[PDB]
Every structure is written in structure tokens, then in C-alpha cells.
Coordinates of C-alpha atoms and ligand atoms in Angstrom, one line a residue:
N1 CA 3.9 38.1 -41.0
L2 CA 6.8 38.2 -38.6
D3 CA 7.4 41.9 -39.8
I4 CA 4.0 42.7 -38.3
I5 CA 4.3 40.8 -35.1
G6 CA 8.2 40.7 -34.5
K7 CA 8.2 44.2 -32.8
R8 CA 5.5 42.9 -30.3
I9 CA 7.6 39.6 -29.9
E10 CA 11.1 41.3 -29.7
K11 CA 9.8 43.7 -27.0
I12 CA 8.4 40.9 -24.8
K13 CA 11.6 38.8 -25.4
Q14 CA 13.8 41.7 -24.1
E15 CA 11.6 42.4 -20.9
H16 CA 12.6 38.7 -20.0
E17 CA 16.3 38.6 -21.3
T18 CA 17.5 36.4 -18.5
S19 CA 14.4 33.8 -19.3
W20 CA 13.9 33.4 -23.0
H21 CA 13.9 29.7 -24.1
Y22 CA 12.5 28.0 -27.3
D23 CA 11.0 24.9 -25.5
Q24 CA 11.1 22.0 -28.2
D25 CA 8.2 20.2 -26.3
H26 CA 5.6 22.9 -27.0
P27 CA 1.9 21.5 -27.5
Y28 CA 1.1 24.0 -30.3
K29 CA 0.5 22.9 -33.9
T30 CA -2.3 25.3 -35.3
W31 CA -0.7 28.1 -33.4
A32 CA 2.9 29.5 -34.1
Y33 CA 5.2 29.3 -31.1
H34 CA 8.0 31.8 -30.7
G35 CA 9.4 31.3 -27.2
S36 CA 8.6 31.3 -23.4
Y37 CA 9.7 32.9 -20.0
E38 CA 9.1 32.4 -16.1
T39 CA 5.8 33.4 -14.3
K40 CA 3.7 32.0 -11.3
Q41 CA 0.1 32.8 -10.5
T42 CA -3.5 31.8 -11.2
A43 CA -10.9 33.4 -10.1
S44 CA -13.6 30.8 -9.1
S45 CA -17.3 31.6 -8.3
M46 CA -18.4 32.3 -4.7
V47 CA -22.1 31.7 -3.3
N48 CA -24.3 34.6 -2.6
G49 CA -25.6 34.0 0.9
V50 CA -28.5 36.4 0.8
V51 CA -29.9 34.4 -2.2
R52 CA -29.2 31.0 -1.0
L53 CA -30.8 31.5 2.5
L54 CA -34.0 32.7 0.7
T55 CA -34.1 29.7 -1.7
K56 CA -33.8 26.8 0.8
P57 CA -35.8 24.2 -1.3
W58 CA -33.0 24.4 -3.9
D59 CA -30.2 23.3 -1.5
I60 CA -31.2 19.7 -2.5
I61 CA -31.5 20.2 -6.3
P62 CA -28.2 19.0 -8.0
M63 CA -28.8 21.3 -11.1
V64 CA -28.8 24.3 -8.8
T65 CA -26.0 23.1 -6.3
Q66 CA -23.7 21.8 -9.0
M67 CA -23.6 25.2 -11.0
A68 CA -21.5 26.6 -8.1
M69 CA -18.7 24.0 -8.0
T70 CA -15.6 23.3 -10.2
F71 CA -11.9 22.3 -24.7
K72 CA -8.6 24.1 -25.1
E73 CA -8.2 21.3 -27.7
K74 CA -10.8 23.3 -29.7
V75 CA -8.9 26.8 -29.8
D76 CA -5.9 24.7 -31.2
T77 CA -8.1 23.8 -34.3
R78 CA -7.7 25.0 -37.9
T79 CA -10.4 25.6 -40.7
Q80 CA -9.9 24.9 -44.4
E81 CA -9.9 27.9 -46.8
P82 CA -13.4 28.1 -48.5
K83 CA -13.8 27.3 -52.2
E84 CA -13.6 30.2 -54.8
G85 CA -17.3 30.3 -55.2
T86 CA -18.0 30.4 -51.5
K87 CA -15.4 33.3 -51.2
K88 CA -17.2 35.2 -54.0
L89 CA -20.6 34.6 -52.4
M90 CA -19.2 36.0 -49.1
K91 CA -17.3 39.0 -50.6
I92 CA -20.4 40.1 -52.6
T93 CA -22.8 39.6 -49.6
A94 CA -20.5 41.4 -47.2
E95 CA -20.1 44.4 -49.6
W96 CA -23.9 44.6 -50.0
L97 CA -24.4 44.3 -46.2
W98 CA -21.9 47.1 -45.1
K99 CA -23.7 49.3 -47.8
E100 CA -27.1 48.6 -46.2
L101 CA -26.0 49.1 -42.5
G102 CA -24.2 52.4 -43.7
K103 CA -27.4 53.9 -45.4
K104 CA -28.5 55.7 -42.2
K105 CA -25.2 55.6 -40.3
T106 CA -22.0 57.6 -40.2
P107 CA -18.8 55.8 -39.0
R108 CA -17.1 58.1 -36.5
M109 CA -14.3 57.8 -34.0
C110 CA -15.1 57.2 -30.3
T111 CA -13.2 59.5 -27.8
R112 CA -11.3 59.3 -24.4
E113 CA -14.1 61.3 -22.9
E114 CA -16.5 58.4 -23.9
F115 CA -14.0 55.7 -22.9
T116 CA -13.4 57.5 -19.5
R117 CA -17.2 57.6 -18.6
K118 CA -17.4 53.8 -19.6
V119 CA -14.6 52.8 -17.0
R120 CA -16.1 55.1 -14.2
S121 CA -19.6 53.5 -14.4
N122 CA -18.0 50.0 -15.2
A123 CA -18.6 47.8 -18.3
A124 CA -16.5 44.6 -19.0
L125 CA -13.9 46.2 -21.3
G126 CA -11.4 43.6 -20.2
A127 CA -8.0 45.3 -19.2
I128 CA -4.9 44.1 -17.1
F129 CA -3.5 45.4 -13.7
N130 CA 1.4 46.4 -14.5
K131 CA 1.8 50.0 -13.4
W132 CA -1.8 51.2 -12.4
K133 CA -4.1 49.0 -10.1
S134 CA -7.8 49.3 -11.4
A135 CA -8.9 50.5 -15.0
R136 CA -10.4 53.5 -13.0
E137 CA -6.8 54.9 -12.0
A138 CA -5.0 54.7 -15.4
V139 CA -7.8 56.9 -17.1
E140 CA -7.5 59.5 -14.3
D141 CA -3.7 59.8 -14.9
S142 CA -1.9 61.6 -18.0
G143 CA 1.1 59.2 -18.6
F144 CA -1.1 56.3 -19.9
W145 CA -2.4 58.6 -22.6
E146 CA 1.2 59.5 -23.7
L147 CA 1.7 55.6 -24.1
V148 CA -1.7 55.5 -26.0
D149 CA -0.4 58.3 -28.3
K150 CA 2.9 56.5 -29.0
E151 CA 1.1 53.3 -30.1
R152 CA -1.5 55.4 -32.0
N153 CA 1.3 57.2 -34.0
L154 CA 2.9 53.6 -34.6
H155 CA -0.5 52.4 -36.0
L156 CA -0.5 55.3 -38.4
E157 CA 3.1 54.2 -39.2
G158 CA 1.5 50.8 -40.0
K159 CA 3.3 49.0 -37.1
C160 CA 2.3 47.8 -33.5
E161 CA 4.4 47.4 -30.2
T162 CA 2.1 46.6 -27.1
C163 CA -1.3 45.3 -28.6
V164 CA -0.9 41.6 -27.2
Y165 CA -3.8 39.3 -26.0
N166 CA -3.8 37.2 -22.8
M167 CA -5.7 33.7 -23.1
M168 CA -7.7 32.6 -19.8
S169 CA -16.2 26.7 -24.5
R170 CA -15.3 30.2 -23.0
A171 CA -11.6 31.4 -23.4
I172 CA -11.3 35.3 -23.0
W173 CA -8.4 37.2 -24.5
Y174 CA -7.8 40.3 -22.2
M175 CA -5.7 43.2 -23.6
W176 CA -3.9 46.1 -21.7
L177 CA -6.4 49.0 -21.4
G178 CA -4.4 51.1 -24.0
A179 CA -5.1 48.6 -26.7
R180 CA -8.8 48.4 -25.6
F181 CA -9.1 52.3 -26.1
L182 CA -7.4 52.2 -29.7
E183 CA -9.8 49.3 -30.6
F184 CA -12.8 51.3 -29.0
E185 CA -11.6 54.5 -30.8
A186 CA -11.7 52.8 -34.2
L187 CA -14.6 50.3 -34.0
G188 CA -16.7 51.5 -30.9
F189 CA -19.1 53.2 -33.2
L190 CA -20.6 49.8 -34.2
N191 CA -21.9 49.2 -30.6
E192 CA -22.1 52.9 -29.5
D193 CA -24.4 53.9 -32.5
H194 CA -26.5 50.8 -32.6
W195 CA -25.4 49.5 -36.2
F196 CA -27.0 46.1 -35.4
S197 CA -30.3 47.5 -34.0
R198 CA -33.4 45.9 -35.5
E199 CA -34.4 49.3 -37.1
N200 CA -31.0 49.7 -38.9
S201 CA -29.9 45.9 -39.6
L202 CA -33.4 44.2 -39.9
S203 CA -32.0 40.8 -38.6
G204 CA -30.2 42.3 -35.5
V205 CA -31.6 42.7 -31.9
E206 CA -28.7 44.9 -30.3
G207 CA -30.2 46.8 -27.3
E208 CA -33.8 45.2 -27.7
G209 CA -34.0 43.4 -24.3
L210 CA -35.6 40.1 -23.1
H211 CA -39.0 41.7 -22.8
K212 CA -38.8 42.6 -26.6
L213 CA -37.1 39.3 -28.0
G214 CA -40.3 37.2 -27.8
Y215 CA -42.4 39.7 -29.7
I216 CA -39.6 39.9 -32.3
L217 CA -39.7 36.1 -32.7
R218 CA -43.6 36.3 -33.0
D219 CA -43.3 39.0 -35.7
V220 CA -41.0 36.6 -37.8
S221 CA -43.6 33.8 -37.3
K222 CA -46.3 36.0 -39.0
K223 CA -44.3 35.9 -42.3
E224 CA -45.2 33.2 -44.8
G225 CA -42.6 30.5 -44.9
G226 CA -41.6 27.1 -43.6
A227 CA -40.3 26.0 -40.2
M228 CA -38.1 28.3 -37.8
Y229 CA -34.5 27.1 -37.8
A230 CA -32.1 27.7 -34.9
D231 CA -28.9 25.8 -35.6
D232 CA -26.1 26.6 -33.0
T233 CA -22.5 26.6 -34.6
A234 CA -19.8 24.4 -32.8
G235 CA -17.4 26.9 -31.2
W236 CA -18.3 29.9 -33.6
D237 CA -15.2 32.1 -32.5
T238 CA -12.7 29.2 -33.5
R239 CA -14.4 28.9 -37.1
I240 CA -13.9 32.7 -38.0
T241 CA -11.7 32.3 -41.2
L242 CA -9.2 34.9 -42.4
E243 CA -11.8 35.4 -45.3
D244 CA -14.4 36.5 -42.6
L245 CA -11.8 38.9 -41.1
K246 CA -11.2 40.5 -44.6
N247 CA -15.0 40.8 -45.3
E248 CA -15.5 42.4 -41.8
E249 CA -12.5 44.9 -42.7
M250 CA -14.6 46.2 -45.7
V251 CA -16.4 48.5 -43.0
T252 CA -13.2 50.7 -43.5
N253 CA -14.3 51.3 -47.1
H254 CA -17.2 53.4 -45.5
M255 CA -14.7 55.5 -43.4
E256 CA -12.3 58.5 -44.1
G257 CA -9.3 60.4 -42.8
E258 CA -7.5 59.4 -39.6
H259 CA -10.5 57.1 -38.6
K260 CA -10.0 54.9 -41.8
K261 CA -6.2 54.4 -41.2
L262 CA -6.7 53.7 -37.3
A263 CA -9.5 51.1 -38.3
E264 CA -7.4 49.4 -41.1
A265 CA -4.6 49.1 -38.5
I266 CA -6.7 47.5 -35.8
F267 CA -8.0 45.0 -38.6
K268 CA -4.5 44.5 -40.0
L269 CA -2.3 44.4 -36.9
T270 CA -4.6 43.1 -34.0
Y271 CA -7.2 40.9 -35.8
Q272 CA -5.7 39.5 -39.1
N273 CA -2.3 39.1 -37.1
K274 CA -2.5 38.3 -33.3
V275 CA 0.1 37.8 -30.5
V276 CA -1.0 36.0 -27.3
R277 CA 0.7 35.2 -24.0
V278 CA -0.7 31.9 -22.6
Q279 CA 0.5 30.2 -19.3
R280 CA 1.6 26.5 -19.3
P281 CA 2.2 24.9 -15.8
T282 CA 4.7 22.2 -17.2
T283 CA 4.6 27.8 -15.3
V284 CA 6.1 29.4 -18.4
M285 CA 4.4 32.1 -20.6
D286 CA 4.3 30.9 -24.2
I287 CA 4.3 33.7 -26.9
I288 CA 2.2 32.1 -29.8
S289 CA 0.9 33.9 -32.9
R290 CA -2.1 33.2 -35.3
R291 CA -3.8 35.1 -38.1
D292 CA -7.3 33.5 -38.0
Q293 CA -10.1 32.8 -35.3
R294 CA -12.0 35.5 -33.3
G295 CA -9.9 38.0 -31.3
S296 CA -11.3 41.4 -30.2
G297 CA -13.2 43.0 -27.4
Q298 CA -16.3 41.1 -26.2
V299 CA -18.4 44.1 -27.6
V300 CA -16.6 44.4 -31.1
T301 CA -16.7 40.6 -31.0
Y302 CA -20.6 40.8 -30.6
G303 CA -21.0 43.3 -33.7
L304 CA -18.6 41.4 -36.0
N305 CA -20.2 38.0 -34.9
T306 CA -23.7 39.4 -35.8
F307 CA -22.4 40.7 -39.1
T308 CA -20.7 37.5 -40.4
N309 CA -23.7 35.5 -39.0
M310 CA -26.2 37.7 -41.0
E311 CA -24.0 37.1 -44.0
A312 CA -23.7 33.3 -43.7
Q313 CA -27.5 33.0 -43.2
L314 CA -28.4 35.2 -46.2
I315 CA -26.1 32.7 -48.2
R316 CA -27.7 29.7 -46.8
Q317 CA -31.2 31.3 -47.7
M318 CA -29.7 31.9 -51.2
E319 CA -28.7 28.1 -51.5
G320 CA -32.2 26.9 -50.3
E321 CA -33.8 29.2 -53.0
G322 CA -31.4 27.8 -55.7
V323 CA -29.7 31.2 -56.5
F324 CA -26.6 29.4 -57.0
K325 CA -26.0 25.8 -58.0
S326 CA -22.5 25.0 -56.7
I327 CA -19.8 26.7 -54.4
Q328 CA -16.8 25.3 -56.3
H329 CA -17.0 28.2 -58.9
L330 CA -19.7 31.1 -59.5
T331 CA -20.7 31.7 -63.2
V332 CA -20.7 35.4 -64.3
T333 CA -24.6 35.0 -64.6
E334 CA -24.7 33.4 -61.0
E335 CA -22.8 36.5 -59.7
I336 CA -25.4 38.8 -61.4
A337 CA -28.3 36.5 -60.0
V338 CA -26.9 36.6 -56.4
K339 CA -26.4 40.5 -56.7
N340 CA -30.0 40.9 -58.1
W341 CA -31.3 38.6 -55.3
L342 CA -29.8 40.9 -52.7
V343 CA -31.1 44.1 -54.4
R344 CA -34.6 42.6 -55.0
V345 CA -35.3 40.7 -51.8
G346 CA -32.2 41.2 -49.5
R347 CA -34.0 43.4 -47.0
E348 CA -37.2 41.2 -46.8
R349 CA -34.8 38.2 -46.3
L350 CA -33.0 40.0 -43.2
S351 CA -36.5 40.7 -41.7
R352 CA -37.1 36.9 -41.7
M353 CA -34.1 36.4 -39.1
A354 CA -33.3 37.3 -35.5
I355 CA -29.5 37.3 -35.0
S356 CA -27.5 38.0 -31.8
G357 CA -23.8 37.4 -32.3
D358 CA -23.4 33.6 -33.0
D359 CA -27.0 32.9 -32.1
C360 CA -29.8 32.9 -34.9
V361 CA -33.4 32.0 -35.7
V362 CA -34.2 31.9 -39.5
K363 CA -37.7 31.7 -41.0
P364 CA -36.8 30.9 -44.6
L365 CA -39.2 31.0 -47.7
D366 CA -39.7 27.2 -47.3
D367 CA -38.1 23.9 -45.9
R368 CA -35.5 23.5 -48.7
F369 CA -33.3 25.6 -46.3
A370 CA -33.0 22.5 -44.0
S371 CA -30.8 20.6 -46.4
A372 CA -29.0 23.6 -47.9
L373 CA -25.7 22.8 -46.2
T374 CA -22.8 23.1 -48.8
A375 CA -22.0 26.8 -48.4
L376 CA -22.7 26.8 -44.5
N377 CA -20.3 23.8 -44.1
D378 CA -17.6 25.3 -46.6
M379 CA -17.7 28.7 -44.8
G380 CA -16.7 26.6 -41.7
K381 CA -19.9 27.4 -39.7
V382 CA -20.3 23.7 -38.9
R383 CA -23.6 23.0 -36.9
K384 CA -23.4 21.7 -33.3
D385 CA -24.7 18.2 -32.2
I386 CA -25.9 16.8 -35.7
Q387 CA -24.1 15.1 -38.6
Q388 CA -22.5 17.3 -41.1
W389 CA -24.8 16.4 -44.0
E390 CA -27.9 15.5 -41.9
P391 CA -30.8 18.0 -42.6
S392 CA -31.8 20.7 -40.0
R393 CA -34.7 19.8 -37.5
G394 CA -37.0 22.9 -37.8
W395 CA -39.6 24.2 -35.3
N396 CA -43.3 24.5 -36.1
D397 CA -44.2 26.6 -33.0
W398 CA -42.3 30.0 -32.3
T399 CA -43.1 29.3 -28.5
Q400 CA -40.6 26.3 -28.7
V401 CA -37.7 28.1 -30.5
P402 CA -34.6 28.5 -28.5
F403 CA -33.0 32.0 -28.7
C404 CA -30.5 33.9 -26.4
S405 CA -30.8 30.9 -23.8
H406 CA -34.6 31.5 -23.7
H407 CA -38.0 30.3 -24.9
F408 CA -41.1 32.8 -25.1
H409 CA -44.5 32.0 -23.7
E410 CA -47.8 33.8 -25.0
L411 CA -49.6 34.9 -21.7
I412 CA -53.3 36.5 -21.7
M413 CA -53.9 39.0 -19.0
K414 CA -57.3 38.9 -17.1
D415 CA -58.2 42.0 -19.2
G416 CA -57.3 40.3 -22.7
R417 CA -54.0 42.2 -23.3
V418 CA -51.2 39.9 -24.5
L419 CA -47.7 39.5 -22.8
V420 CA -45.0 37.7 -24.6
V421 CA -42.6 36.7 -21.7
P422 CA -39.1 35.3 -21.6
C423 CA -38.5 31.9 -19.8
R424 CA -35.8 29.2 -19.2
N425 CA -35.4 26.2 -16.9
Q426 CA -35.9 27.7 -13.3
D427 CA -33.0 25.6 -12.0
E428 CA -30.8 27.7 -14.4
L429 CA -32.2 31.1 -13.1
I430 CA -31.9 30.1 -9.3
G431 CA -28.4 28.6 -9.8
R432 CA -27.0 31.9 -11.4
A433 CA -28.5 34.2 -8.7
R434 CA -26.8 32.0 -6.1
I435 CA -23.4 32.9 -7.7
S436 CA -21.2 36.2 -7.2
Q437 CA -18.2 36.7 -9.6
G438 CA -15.3 38.0 -7.5
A439 CA -14.3 37.8 -3.8
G440 CA -13.8 40.7 -1.4
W441 CA -17.7 41.4 -1.2
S442 CA -19.1 43.0 2.0
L443 CA -22.5 41.8 3.3
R444 CA -24.0 45.0 1.8
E445 CA -22.6 44.5 -1.6
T446 CA -23.8 40.7 -1.6
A447 CA -27.2 41.9 -0.5
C448 CA -27.3 44.5 -3.3
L449 CA -26.4 41.9 -5.9
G450 CA -29.2 39.5 -4.6
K451 CA -31.6 42.6 -5.0
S452 CA -30.5 43.0 -8.6
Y453 CA -31.6 39.4 -9.3
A454 CA -34.8 39.8 -7.3
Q455 CA -35.8 42.9 -9.4
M456 CA -34.8 41.2 -12.7
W457 CA -37.1 38.2 -11.7
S458 CA -40.0 40.6 -10.9
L459 CA -39.5 42.4 -14.3
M460 CA -38.8 39.4 -16.7
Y461 CA -39.8 36.2 -14.8
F462 CA -42.9 37.5 -12.9
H463 CA -45.0 34.6 -14.5
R464 CA -43.0 31.9 -12.6
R465 CA -44.7 31.4 -9.1
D466 CA -41.4 30.5 -7.3
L467 CA -39.5 33.5 -8.7
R468 CA -42.2 36.1 -7.8
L469 CA -42.3 34.7 -4.3
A470 CA -38.4 34.5 -4.0
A471 CA -38.1 38.0 -5.5
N472 CA -40.7 39.5 -3.0
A473 CA -38.7 37.6 -0.1
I474 CA -35.2 39.0 -1.2
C475 CA -36.5 42.6 -1.7
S476 CA -38.2 42.3 1.8
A477 CA -34.9 41.0 3.3
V478 CA -32.6 43.7 1.8
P479 CA -33.0 47.4 3.2
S480 CA -35.6 49.2 1.1
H481 CA -33.3 52.0 0.0
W482 CA -30.0 50.0 -0.7
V483 CA -29.2 50.1 -4.4
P484 CA -28.9 47.1 -6.8
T485 CA -25.3 46.5 -8.0
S486 CA -23.6 44.2 -10.7
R487 CA -19.9 43.6 -11.6
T488 CA -20.8 43.3 -15.3
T489 CA -23.8 45.5 -16.5
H490 CA -26.8 42.8 -21.8
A491 CA -29.3 44.9 -24.0
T492 CA -31.4 46.8 -21.5
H493 CA -31.3 46.5 -17.7
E494 CA -34.5 48.3 -16.4
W495 CA -34.2 46.4 -13.0
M496 CA -31.1 48.4 -12.1
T497 CA -33.0 51.1 -10.2
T498 CA -34.5 52.1 -6.7
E499 CA -37.9 52.9 -8.2
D500 CA -41.1 50.9 -7.4
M501 CA -40.9 47.6 -9.2
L502 CA -44.8 47.8 -10.3
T503 CA -44.0 51.3 -11.7
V504 CA -41.1 49.9 -13.9
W505 CA -43.3 46.8 -14.9
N506 CA -45.9 49.3 -16.1
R507 CA -43.3 51.5 -18.0
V508 CA -41.7 48.3 -19.5
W509 CA -44.7 46.0 -20.4
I510 CA -47.6 48.6 -21.0
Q511 CA -46.3 52.2 -21.6
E512 CA -43.1 51.6 -23.7
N513 CA -44.3 48.3 -25.4
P514 CA -45.1 48.9 -29.2
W515 CA -47.0 45.7 -29.3
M516 CA -49.7 46.9 -26.7
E517 CA -52.5 49.1 -28.3
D518 CA -54.4 49.8 -24.8
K519 CA -52.1 51.7 -22.4
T520 CA -54.3 51.3 -19.2
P521 CA -51.8 51.1 -16.2
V522 CA -51.9 48.0 -14.1
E523 CA -52.8 49.0 -10.4
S524 CA -51.4 45.9 -8.3
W525 CA -49.3 42.7 -8.8
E526 CA -52.6 40.6 -8.7
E527 CA -53.5 42.0 -12.2
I528 CA -50.2 40.4 -13.4
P529 CA -50.7 36.8 -14.5
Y530 CA -48.7 33.5 -14.2
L531 CA -48.1 30.7 -16.6
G532 CA -50.5 27.6 -16.2
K533 CA -49.4 25.7 -13.0
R534 CA -48.6 22.7 -15.4
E535 CA -46.6 25.0 -17.8
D536 CA -44.7 26.4 -14.6
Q537 CA -43.9 22.8 -13.5
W538 CA -42.7 21.9 -17.0
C539 CA -40.1 24.9 -16.8
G540 CA -38.9 23.7 -13.4
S541 CA -41.3 25.0 -10.7
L542 CA -41.2 23.2 -7.3
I543 CA -45.0 24.0 -6.8
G544 CA -46.7 20.9 -5.5
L545 CA -43.7 19.7 -3.4
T546 CA -43.7 19.6 0.4
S547 CA -40.3 21.3 0.6
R548 CA -41.8 24.3 -1.4
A549 CA -45.0 24.6 0.5
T550 CA -43.1 24.8 3.8
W551 CA -40.8 27.5 2.3
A552 CA -43.7 29.6 1.1
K553 CA -45.7 29.0 4.4
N554 CA -42.8 30.1 6.7
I555 CA -41.2 32.6 4.3
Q556 CA -41.4 35.7 6.9
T557 CA -39.0 33.4 9.1
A558 CA -36.4 33.2 6.2
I559 CA -36.8 36.9 5.6
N560 CA -36.3 37.6 9.3
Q561 CA -33.1 35.3 9.5
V562 CA -31.5 37.6 6.7
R563 CA -32.8 40.9 8.4
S564 CA -31.0 39.8 11.7
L565 CA -27.7 39.1 9.8
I566 CA -27.6 42.4 7.9
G567 CA -28.8 44.3 11.1
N568 CA -31.1 47.2 12.4
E569 CA -31.8 48.9 9.0
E570 CA -35.2 50.1 7.3
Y571 CA -37.0 47.1 5.7
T572 CA -40.3 47.0 3.6
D573 CA -42.6 43.9 3.7
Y574 CA -43.3 43.0 0.0
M575 CA -45.1 39.6 0.7
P576 CA -48.5 41.2 0.9
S577 CA -48.4 42.1 -2.9
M578 CA -49.2 38.5 -3.3
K579 CA -52.9 37.0 -2.8
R580 CA -51.9 34.2 -0.4
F581 CA -50.0 36.7 1.9
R582 CA -52.6 39.5 1.6
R583 CA -53.7 38.2 5.2
Ligands
LIG1 C1 -25.7 43.1 -26.7 C2 -27.1 42.6 -26.8 N1 -28.1 43.2 -27.1 C3 -29.2 42.4 -27.1 C4 -29.0 41.2 -26.9 C5 -30.0 40.0 -26.8 N2 -29.8 39.0 -25.8 C6 -30.1 39.2 -24.5 C7 -29.7 38.3 -23.4 N3 -29.8 38.4 -22.3 C8 -30.3 39.5 -21.7 C9 -30.7 40.5 -22.6 F1 -31.3 41.7 -22.1 C10 -30.6 40.4 -23.9 S1 -27.4 40.9 -26.5
LIG2 C1 -50.5 20.7 -9.7 C2 -50.9 21.7 -8.7 N1 -52.0 22.2 -8.4 C3 -52.0 23.1 -7.5 C4 -50.8 23.4 -6.9 C5 -50.4 24.4 -5.9 N2 -49.6 25.5 -6.4 C6 -49.9 26.8 -6.7 C7 -49.3 27.9 -6.1 N3 -49.6 29.2 -6.3 C8 -50.6 29.4 -7.2 C9 -51.3 28.4 -7.9 F1 -52.1 28.6 -8.9 C10 -51.0 27.1 -7.7 S1 -49.6 22.4 -7.6
LIG3 ZN1 -0.8 48.2 -31.4
LIG4 ZN1 -41.0 28.2 -20.0

């Protein structure tokens, strides 16, 4: 305990020797509280003007406008230790699942070279400012790496000095860049080498992309079974048990040499024992500790969430199939039965699921799954917005299943070929495009973010009448050659490019689409179909409203307003790619 965190604590305590005070009115119960010290400082959303000026009808939709305005009593929760039978079910399943993921993969260390490219082309690794300004600067230096080396040698010693989280249903724990590297060195392979790919994991979708998710849900639908189940967990990261953290750590069993010790240290020191600096305006910096809950990089979090979610869902399948009778204790015969289930049908059972971190869709063997709730509830993976022992409401139609904030439509092209297209409430799409994260943006940068959104809409949401039109308008209003930008790059972002959008559509939807047998390129945008105009209205379209018809009719005037603001640049008119504007 304090042997493992004390060094980290004692080091912080000393850098504020004229401040340290053990405030006796600290609000922590579930989190251990060590002390405090003096600080004073805070990033709200800004509106993207290029997008808003070209989406005027939406200036009066409260669902769009409210998205741009404005529980920490959930992070301070505690989950009960699972029963012995639950713990055995999890240990056995975790062992078998690491083996399966490892069959065609080699754990390996990631390198500074790799980490250095990441920071120069910008991911969201989540660092802090201090001694160097940006993340870009500290990597270019040589002193930072000497710091890294020190901590690394300490990790091999089995101690830790500077790996401390900073808190800030979305609470992010940013770490200093050095700690991020040591985490990425040890565990980056999980993301970098696609361990949770559909090919390697059977349930996973890592790197598959929105244009593939709908086809994958449909492939699951083709299996014999009962309803499709899509239970969200109530605050998944706050319900990761120490038992989950120990079963994740069994990935080190597949490692060797330096890598194995470095990985064990990350699991032992930064995951199974955590030290966090949280601000408290009453402004002190509280130094609290905790062994449980999900702390890690957003990207290792994703891989370990997918892993533990796969594990829980295999066990819920086992329960619905009556592989084990009770979670209180597992008979020696029940252990063998579980083990032989995994060996005999485990891979088939994984192919019945689509899992993206804390998000899942299961098509179990039959509807017994709906009331198989004892293992799920005991593991602490308590379902959101339904009573604890109330049976799951399944879905009969794969086109109604929620997954990764989307639903999927089946859409028939004029030539018989079949698109499965992603979709969500259009107010959600327009409200997100109207928002820029960070201030300090030039007109040019703001314009290039709008163009990223426009190109995503043309690629993913082309079947929505208002999004094809607004996307054509934004791309007409931003200089033809200006490059699309984004301040967090997830899966596959084929819209981040200066190439012709019809050429990308053809590559993504026809050429590279393994569900399309005929590879005939499409020759214009008019070949590319829309949802039915009632289906479009159901998913939030403004077609049929007066405000919308005036906007479409007078779009060239909105385009010209934005062209005037940006200035005398080279523009393309994309509106004639649509039938109604083609004279
Ligand atoms: C790291 C990931 N790999 C695939 C994912 C599936 N989810 C998704 C959501 N939004 C846009 C996407 F391209 C994909 S998440
Ligand atoms: C219920 C409605 N019936 C026709 C409408 C007009 N909206 C529209 C726009 N572009 C292409 C279309 F097929 C239809 S709204
Ligand atoms: Zn450390
Ligand atoms: Zn829809």
C-alpha cells in the first residue's frame, strides 16, 4: 500500500513544504486522502462560425443550440468484491481469452521513435505543460528522456516516483508525458498491433470504421439465436474491480525479459495502486489514493475495457446456457464444464458479439440470456436505466440495435447493390460540427475543421438529404485546396484528405468493401441513394419545413457570405453535384 505510493506522495509533499495541511473536512470516503496544498486556475466549447453560418435553419432547434452551452458523486463509489465462484469464472475466462488473443500475436515493447511520431502528427495521449510547453517540445529535447530513464530504472527496482494522475459521466486523468511513454512502451502493442481487431479477437471492432460496423452487426444477425442485446453499463470505468485489474495483468504471462517487468510495474504501480491530484475550490490540490476503478490512457483503457467486456459477456452467455448453476462456489465438475465450453464453443460465442470498449451487442444462442443476471450483477457490471433483476429488453431487428452511438440502415442502390450505412439523430450530428474544442483558432483553422465535418458527412451520412446539401455548401465555401484538420484524430478517418470525395466514396463503399461482389465504380453523386424521405424525417431531417426550403433555395447566398469573410481565394462550386442545383 503506502510503501508503493508513499514515494510519489512524499515527493509531492516536499515540492509544497510551506503548504502541506491534512484538512479534516475532506469529502472523500471511497478514496484515501493524504493531504493538500495551494493552487489557482481552471476549457469550454466554442462555436465554429463556418458551420453555423451554413446551417441557419438549426439556429432555432434547442437540441442543436443547447449542445454548445454550459456525477463526481459516481467516481466516489465502491464496488463489493465478487463471490468466489464469480472470481473463478473470471480468472478461468481471462486466462483462456489472453491465450486466444496471443495465438497469432507477439507482445513487444513500443519505442520512443514510435511515441515521437505519434506526438508530431498529434493523437490525444493526454500529457501536462511544468518545464516544456507543448508535448511536441519535450520529445525534441534530451533531458526529458533522462527523466524517463530514471523512472524506468525505478520501475525495474519495483518502485515509482512521478506517475501521478490529474482528475478533470466523463472525468479524464491526464498524466505527465514521461508516464504516458512508459505506459505506451509496455502496453501500446495492444492498440498498435490490433489485438482487438475482428480478425484476431472475433468480438472486437478495433480499426473497423463506421462504414464497416453496420455490415458486422448484420453478419451477427445471420447467426441462429434469439434477440440482439445491447445493455449499457452504468459508469463502466467506476465498476472495474481490483479482480478485473488482476485478470487484465495476466497479459504479462505472455511476455518476457525487460518487457514483462516493465508491464508488471505499470499494472502493479499505476493501475492496481493510483495517486491523483484533484482541485477543490473550498482552491487546494487534494492528493487522494485508490487501488480500484479504471485509470490508464484513453487508448489502453479502450483495449482493457474491450477485454474485460468480452470476458463478462462470455460469462453471461455461460449463465444463460446453464454451464454453471450458482456464483457462490464453482464445483470441480463446473470448472471442467466451463473450461470445456470455452474450448468447444468459445470462438463461436465470441463471433456472436460486437464489442467496442464498454459498448456491446450480443446475439446469444437464445433468450435465456435476458434473465441471466447473477454473474453480470456480482461482477459489478450493473446495467444502466433498468431494475437490477428486471430481464433485458432484446431487439428483433438489427437495424434498430444501438452501437457506438449509431443505428444502421439497409439501403438499396438504383443498381441493386446494398449499402449498410451508419446513422444517428441529425440534431446530434449538426450540434457536434458546430463545436470547436480549444480557443486560439484562426478563420483558416476554423474553416478547415468545418471541412473535416463536411467530408465526414459526404462519406458516412450521404444518405441524409440535409447533410449532403450542407456538406456540399461547406466544401463550396472553404478554399478548394485548404486541408481538413482535427485536434483529436476513432477507427478509420478516410475523410481526412484533399482527394476528390466521390473518389474516396468509391474506394471506401465499392473497392475496399468486402460485402460488395460487383466493383463497378459509381460515376456521379446522383447514382448514390438517400434514405426514404419519411425515414429521413424520423432521423431528424428538416425536409418539408419552410425554413429548410428557403435555406436550400438560397444556399449560394450563404456560401457567398462565408466566401466574403474568408476572402479572395480559389473556390469550387460543389452544389451542381446535386440534381436540384444541376441547373
Ligand atoms: C478505437 C476504435 N476503433 C473502432 C471503433 C468503433 N467505433 C467508432 C465510433 N466512431 C467512429 C468510428 F470510426 C468508429 S472505436
Ligand atoms: C414529406 C415530404 N415529401 C417531399 C418532401 C420534399 N423534400 C425532399 C427533398 N429532396 C429530395 C426529396 F426526395 C424530397 S418532404
Ligand atoms: Zn512510475
Ligand atoms: Zn437513421
